[PDB]
Each structure stands twice: as structure tokens, then as C-alpha cells.
């Protein structure tokens, strides 16, 4: 009874430990898949790319937000975003639909979030470093940026706008 129950419990726990292992693996395989696809653009470029948060608004690609959008391919644009306290430049960001958008986002004070609502673009922004993500907007229109990392008292109201052009 105790002898029998122990025999079965263990016998069956093993099946489960194999099944759970399999399921875990199939997940891994499905994560790997996405790694191979255009949807993985949103993963930040793990390349270090230091800048100086003190001077960034005076010199460089962040000093003039009216020039933050730069075409880099026949169908690709680079946008230079400053997430700050408490907002984003430029406002709005305007890109055409169907183009690959290389977001190069940095902070001048604290850490903010750059979470583009309705999209997969959700990347921490750290002062001193440029955070690089890639996205291609499919539907034209107005998307909202939300700061999802605590950045001081002005946090709840810290939003931005991306406007995708038909």
C-alpha cells in the first residue's frame, strides 16, 4: 500500500517530468523561430554605444529633433529619439508605413521606457547609452508611446506620439 503507492507516484512523476521537459523544449523551439523572423527587430542591438547625456541636447543627432528622421536605405529610416523628463523629442515622430524604422533612443536624465502602444517595441532607455530597435509599421495612423519605467514624479503623464504616414 505504502510500498505500492510510492512505486506508482514515482513511476508517474517521471512521465510528467519528461512531458514538461518536452513542452519546455517546444517553447524553446518556438522562441528560436521568432529569433529568425522580422518580428525579432524589436530585440535591442546588444552593441554598446556610449554617448554623453550632458551634451546630447547640444551636439549630435539629438540636438535638432526636426532632423531626427534620416533615410538610410531605399526603404529604411533612422529616427533619433530623446526620451526625457518628461516626454520625447520629436513630437510627433513621423515615418512612412512599410519602411524599416531603426529607432536610436537615449536619455539625458534618468531611465525611461519606450513602449510603443499596439506594437512589440518595448525597450528600456538608459542615460549614457543608445538603445537600438527595428520595426516596420504596417497600419498607418497614430500610435502612442508610453514610458513604462519609473522616472520620477512626472511618470504617469509621460507620453509620446508616432504618426505613421499612409
Amino acid at each position: 500500500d505504502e510500498h505500492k503507492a510510492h512505486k506508482a507516484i514515482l513511476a508517474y512523476e517521471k512521465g510528467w517530468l519528461a512531458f514538461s521537459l518536452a513542452m519546455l523544449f517546444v517553447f524553446i523551439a518556438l522562441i528560436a523561430y521568432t529569433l529568425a523572423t522580422h518580428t525579432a527587430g524589436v530585440i535591442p542591438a546588444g552593441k554598446l554605444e556610449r554617448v554623453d547625456p550632458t551634451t546630447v541636447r547640444q551636439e549630435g543627432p539629438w540636438a535638432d529633433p526636426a532632423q531626427a528622421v534620416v533615410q538610410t536605405g531605399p526603404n529604411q529610416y533612422t529616427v533619433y529619439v530623446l526620451a526625457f523628463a518628461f516626454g520625447y523629442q520629436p513630437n510627433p515622430i513621423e515615418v512612412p508605413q512599410g519602411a524599416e524604422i531603426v529607432f536610436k533612443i537615449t536619455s539625458p536624465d534618468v531611465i525611461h521606457g519606450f513602449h510603443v502602444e499596439g506594437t512589440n517595441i518595448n525597450v528600456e532607455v538608459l542615460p549614457g547609452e543608445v538603445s537600438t530597435v527595428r520595426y516596420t509599421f504596417k497600419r498607418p495612423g497614430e500610435y502612442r508611446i508610453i514610458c513604462n519605467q519609473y522616472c520620477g514624479l512626472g511618470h504617469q503623464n509621460m507620453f509620446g506620439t508616432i504618426v505613421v504616414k499612409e
Binding site: 556610449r50 512589440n120 504617469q156
Partner: protein
């Protein structure tokens, strides 16, 4: 009591723990209504006038609930339980040293916390700069564990010395792997505190590199959450079985779980840094894979623990596929709390698993999903487990008895707690799926998230439910504390028996080769963190601190 002075030290670690839970928790129902788009902060400010911002409360809440209370409890359990199993006395000098270190560190850190001087949340990321008293007070508090680590390794070796050629007793095996795992895990934050945080806050250096600090933090960051969970697992494993009316189905299966937590708790921390720049994707993919592995031991636990209960319930006449569930001791809160906690742990880890999968993390990162997920983890399973210990530990420690009525009030707190955590978990997951950011005073921007009107009602409800549960627990805790009957103090801890099947002596012995596994575990940390850290220290780029509150 003059013969078991470990009882008094254990007592203090518990009470201070519970105090911290209460004070921290006061802020919870307020954050709940906040995420239900309802602003009750006005009211609270009248009531507790030092509170200057939603965020000041959110610092207190996390610091006091997630850092202070959980650890005290870990310390209270994972020293005393092994001490009683081995029937041996702790180094009382050390045992007190550790308590004072915790109490002193806590008082010091509480001062700037209460003074609106370190409103940075429990993760304290630079370049947000808190008062030096916070980081020192934090450090001294956390270092208190090193003294606990010693005590238990002490006890361990002394026992082995008196008993060579014998396998480490269960609770003691769990406790030892626990602490050893914590040591490795603790280095990250120590390093962050010592190399970076302290000097900065003291003003020795002008700025800190936010990326390196996040990296060092999340070293300690993740395995700290297992350090939180394990003492509850220890109880669920080596006690719950008896309270449920049965036995633990497998000694070795429990050990395997714990061994896995030693090897797999630390090297997985990029999972908190999936949205961080300057960290190679390949390493993220690695850490994600390894994270997925560390789910195994809980998955294993799930079965070992469930089976133990089925057995417990069948012995009590349960017949059928469900019969055993209703056969269990549901009138006993010491039994109920943890079971309920494990229940909410299903959806809990289910979200953990998602969070862990890299690219899927971008769907949920930094949204209310997260808090919704982890409240099932720490604020439920662990908290509940520690709650039901009132009904078996406390009498064990103080002689004082649990009246019949107090028991019933216990069931109430436990149940309403569990229910509140469920309800809130719905609202938050749902709200995070609608993009509502975590860590935001959203009720102050009330026209910002209209699509989130449904889940918001769950939030509010959860708020009031959990206010009632907390209130009840306060009343009840103080009704037990401020109550000594003789046999209740000297009677044994409800350590369960183990079911009789030839075990795996071969594996139990292997697992007992602890020196070996400790090194293995450490090598993994070097392999998994090493490369990235070298590249990150090579290219340090500190930045000015800010105080935006």
C-alpha cells in the same frame, strides 16, 4: 526557553517580519484602487501624513513587503527548522548578531525612506539617486544573511562531525543548499553596493553606469526571489504533508528540486534585462533557455507536493478523483494558507514561463501584467505560507495557544487574502495586456487608459477585499501575540514522515556531495555572467545622479 534560546531569536525574526509586512501592506489597497482608476491617496495622506507621493508608498511597499519581511521569514525558517531537525543549538552569539544587523540596517534604511529621501522603488536603479542611508541600511540589512549562512553551515558541519558516513538530513540538506545558493546570488548586489552604489551616494564618485548597475543588480535580483520562495517550499515539503494528514511521498525528489535550485537559481538574470540595450542577444537567448530550466524544480515540486496531498487525502477516506480534496483538513488554516498559495501559483508560474521567453517578454514587460503575475508568487504563495505558520510555529515558539475562534479568524484572513490576490491578478494581467504601465499613478491620469475599464473594476474590488483581509490579519496577529500553556511550547514541530519505498541511495549520496555542487553552481555563474561583465566593465560610462521627486 532557557534551554531553547533559538526559539526567542526565531520569534523576533518572525515578528519584525510580520511588522514589516503590515506597514508595507498598508500601501497595497491604495495601489489596488489606483490601478482601478480610483484616487484614494488624499485619504491616506490625512491618515499617514509623512507620505508625500504615490511613489513614496510604492518604495515603502516593495522594500518592506518584498525585501524586509520575506528575508526575515527566510531567516526565521531556514535557521530554526534545521536546528530542530538536527536537535542542535545554533550559535546564539551569531544568531543574535544577525538579528541586530537586520534590525539596525532596517532602522537606518527606514529613516530616509520615511523622509522622502530615497523614493526610487525597491530596485533603486541609477541614475535616480537615493540618500546614502538607504543603500548602507539596505546593505547592512542584506549582509545579515551572511551571518545566517555561517550559522547553518556551522550547525551542518558539527552534525556531520558527530555523524560521518551519514547523509545530510532532509530539512538540513534543503537549508544548506538554500544558503549556499544565496551566497553566490548575494555577490551581485554586494558588488553593486560596494563598487558603485555606496561610493556614489556618499559622493566619492560623480556618476554611475546605469547598465552595469542593472546587470549587477539582476545578478542578485532573480535568485533573491528563490531565496524568498524556498523557505515556504521547505515548509510545504517537510511539514504540510503532516498537517494534511499524510506523508511526504519522496525524500530524494525533494532534494533533487533543491539541488536544482542551487545550480539553476543565479545564472538566469538577463530575463529581467530583455529590454536592456548593450547586452548581446545570444546571451539573452542563453539566459532564457536556462531560466526555462529553473522552472523544472518547481514543476517537479508541483507533482511531488500534489501527490503528497492526494496521499494525505486518501488516508482520510477520500475516494474518487476529487474525493481526496474534500477529505483534507480545510478547517485548519496552517494547512489551508499554503495549499491556497500553491493554487494561485499555477497561473503564477504560467506567467513566469511566458515572461521567460525572450521575445514574448516585449508583449508584457513593465506593464501591470508583471505585478499581476508576481503577486501570485510572493504576495500570495510565500505570504500565505508564512501566515499559516502563525498557527503552528508561533505556539511552538511561545507556549501561547491558538484559541478556537482565532483559528476561524485565521481561515477568514487566509481565504479572503487568497481571493483578493486572485481578483487583483485578473485585473492586472488583463490591464497589462491592454498596455497599462506598471509603477504608474494611473488614477491621476484618469482619461489615459479607457480600454481598461473592465479589469479596473477587478482592481478596485481586490483593493477593498484585501483591505478587509489585511485589517483582519492585523487584529488577529496582535490577538495572538498579546495573548503561555506548557505542552504547546515543548511539543514537537509537525515534521511529516516519509513514505516507504526504497529510495535512491545512489542519488541521495550523489546529491549529498555538496562541496561539489556548490562549485558547479559557481562555475555556471562565471560562464553565464562572466563574459558580459568583463565587456561591461571594460567600457564603463558613468552618468550624473538625479532626484526627480
Amino acid at each position: 526557553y532557557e534551554a531553547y534560546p533559538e526559539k526567542k531569536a526565531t520569534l523576533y525574526f518572525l515578528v519584525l517580519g510580520f511588522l514589516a509586512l503590515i506597514v508595507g501592506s498598508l500601501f497595497g489597497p491604495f495601489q489596488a484602487l489606483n490601478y482601478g482608476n480610483v484616487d484614494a491617496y488624499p485619504l491616506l495622506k490625512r491618515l499617514l501624513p509623512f507620505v508625500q507621493s504615490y511613489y513614496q508608498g510604492l518604495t515603502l511597499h516593495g522594500v518592506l513587503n518584498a525585501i524586509v519581511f520575506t528575508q526575515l521569514f527566510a531567516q526565521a525558517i531556514m535557521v530554526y527548522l534545521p536546528a530542530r531537525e538536527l536537535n542542535m543549538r545554533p550559535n546564539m552569539g551569531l544568531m543574535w548578531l544577525s538579528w541586530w544587523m537586520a534590525f539596525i540596517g532596517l532602522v537606518v534604511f527606514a529613516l530616509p525612506l520615511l523622509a522622502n529621501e530615497a523614493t526610487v522603488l525597491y530596485t533603486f536603479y541609477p541614475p535616480l539617486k537615493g540618500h546614502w542611508a538607504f543603500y548602507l541600511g539596505a546593505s547592512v540589512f542584506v549582509l545579515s544573511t551572511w551571518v545566517s549562512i555561517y550559522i547553518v553551515l556551522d550547525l551542518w558541519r558539527r552534525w556531520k562531525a558527530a555523524n560521518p558516513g551519514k547523509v545530510t538530513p532532509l530539512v538540513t540538506y534543503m537549508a544548506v543548499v538554500f544558503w549556499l545558493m544565496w551566497f553566490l546570488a548575494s555577490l551581485g548586489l554586494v558588488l553593486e553596493a560596494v563598487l558603485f552604489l555606496l561610493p556614489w551616494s556618499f559622493g566619492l564618485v560623480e556618476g554611475v553606469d546605469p547598465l552595469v548597475a542593472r546587470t549587477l543588480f539582476w545578478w542578485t535580483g532573480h535568485p533573491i526571489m528563490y531565496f524568498w520562495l524556498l523557505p515556504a517550499y521547505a515548509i510545504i515539503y517537510t511539514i504540510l504533508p503532516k498537517q494534511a494528514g499524510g506523508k511526504l511521498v519522496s525524500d530524494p525528489m525533494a532534494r533533487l528540486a533543491f539541488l536544482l535550485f542551487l545550480l539553476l537559481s543565479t545564472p538566469v538574470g538577463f530575463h529581467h534585462q530583455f529590454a536592456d540595450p548593450g547586452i548581446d542577444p545570444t546571451w539573452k537567448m542563453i539566459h532564457s533557455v536556462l531560466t526555462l530550466f529553473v522552472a523544472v524544480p518547481s514543476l517537479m515540486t508541483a507533482f511531488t507536493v500534489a501527490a503528497s496531498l492526494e496521499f494525505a487525502g486518501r488516508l482520510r477516506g477520500g475516494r474518487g478523483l476529487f474525493g481526496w480534496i474534500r477529505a483534507l483538513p480545510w478547517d485548519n488554516p496552517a494547512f489551508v494558507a499554503p495549499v491556497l498559495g500553491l493554487l494561485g501559483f499555477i497561473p503564477g508560474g504560467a506567467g513566469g514561463i511566458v515572461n521567460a521567453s525572450f521575445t514574448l517578454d516585449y508583449v508584457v514587460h513593465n506593464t501591470a501584467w508583471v505585478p499581476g503575475h508576481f503577486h501570485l508568487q510572493v504576495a500570495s504563495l510565500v505570504t500565505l505560507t508564512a501566515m499559516g505558520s502563525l498557527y503552528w510555529l508561533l505556539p511552538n515558539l511561545t507556549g501561547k495557544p491558538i484559541s478556537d475562534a482565532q483559528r476561524r479568524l485565521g481561515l477568514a484572513v487566509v481565504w479572503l487574502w487568497f481571493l483578493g490576490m486572485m481578483i487583483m491578478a485578473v485585473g492586472l494581467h488583463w490591464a497589462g495586456l491592454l498596455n497599462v504601465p506598471r509603477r504608474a499613478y494611473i488614477a491621476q491620469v484618469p482619461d489615459a487608459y479607457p480600454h481598461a475599464a473592465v479589469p479596473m473594476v477587478f482592481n478596485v474590488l481586490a483593493g477593498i477585499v484585501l483591505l478587509v483581509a489585511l485589517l483582519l490579519f492585523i487584529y488577529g496577529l496582535f490577538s495572538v501575540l498579546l495573548s503561555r500553556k506548557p505542552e504547546l511550547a515543548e511539543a514537537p514541530l509537525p515534521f511529516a514522515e516519509v513514505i516507504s519505498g526504497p529510495e535512491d541511495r545512489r542519488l541521495v549520496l550523489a546529491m549529498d556531495r555538496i562541496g561539489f555542487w556548490f562549485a558547479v553552481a559557481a562555475i555556471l555563474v562565471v560562464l553565464a555572467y562572466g563574459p558580459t561583465l568583463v565587456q561591461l566593465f571594460g567600457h564603463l560610462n558613468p552618468v550624473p545622479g538625479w532626484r526627480l521627486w
